Amino acid sequence: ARKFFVGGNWKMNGSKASIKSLVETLNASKLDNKTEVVVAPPAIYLPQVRQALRKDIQVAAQNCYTKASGAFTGEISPEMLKDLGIPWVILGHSERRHIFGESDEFVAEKVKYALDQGLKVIACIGETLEEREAGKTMEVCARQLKAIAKKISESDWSNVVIAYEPVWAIGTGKVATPEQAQEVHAAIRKWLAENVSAEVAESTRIIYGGSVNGGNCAELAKQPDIDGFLVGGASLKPEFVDIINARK
């Protein structure tokens, strides 16, 4: 069965002191050994975290670029991440797609380059409120996924986790039910089956990237096509532990 997966996206949040506290809390907590756990600090805190954090939680960057090196002021390469012992990267997050204009193709180029350099990737997809109102949830997810599928091989999906972000229920005032989330996750899995392969569909974790907290994580985790979470704000808090432990 697919291993339950809980990622924590810290986004642009943290100080040395707050991160020291966050890490200390994780280091003193009893975690379900059946959960694969990844945390994504801001880039400048990656060293602090990889040095202090328990080894059974892996670290991710929040973004990277599409080349090994060169004249790209402000960008980081997958080679640098590997060099510092950062095994994961989050790519195509809604905030990068919408605020920083990252296109479907640019995201797909990053996913392929990161995989080729030996990173594991949390690849983010999802639809806006306007797109959902139009009945375009799967049109959008299919488009975003197709761009990735055109760049990566069937085998390459092995080290991909798909994060479904209900952008329509992130910062909009709308909320998603576990049933609504499940419906999308099942449809994404069907897309994988029909476009990649049945084996990719059955193997690939599809994690929920909407609002996840200690209070709702158990009900979400019960859904049969939800393989875990890409947690936002709760990832900065002690209740992240409860989310890791959502199946217990």
Task: Give the residue numbers marked as catalytic.
Answer: 93, 165
d(CA 74, CA 72): 6
Strands (E) located in the chain? 4-9, 35-40, 58-61, 88-91, 120-125, 160-164, 206-208, 228-231
- The answer to whether the CB of 160 falls within 8 A of the CB of 110 is no
In the numeric block, which tokens belong to residue 200?
A: 């990719």
Gaps in the chain (C–N > 2.5 Å) come after which residues?
Answer: none
In the numeric block, which tokens belong to residue 209?
A: 């990237």
In terms of Cα–Cα distance, which of 57, 33, 59, 56 is closest to 46? Answer: 59
Q: Return the half-sphere exposure (C-beta side, CA atoms, 13 A cut-off) of residue 67.
A: 7
Three-state DSSP state, 230: strand
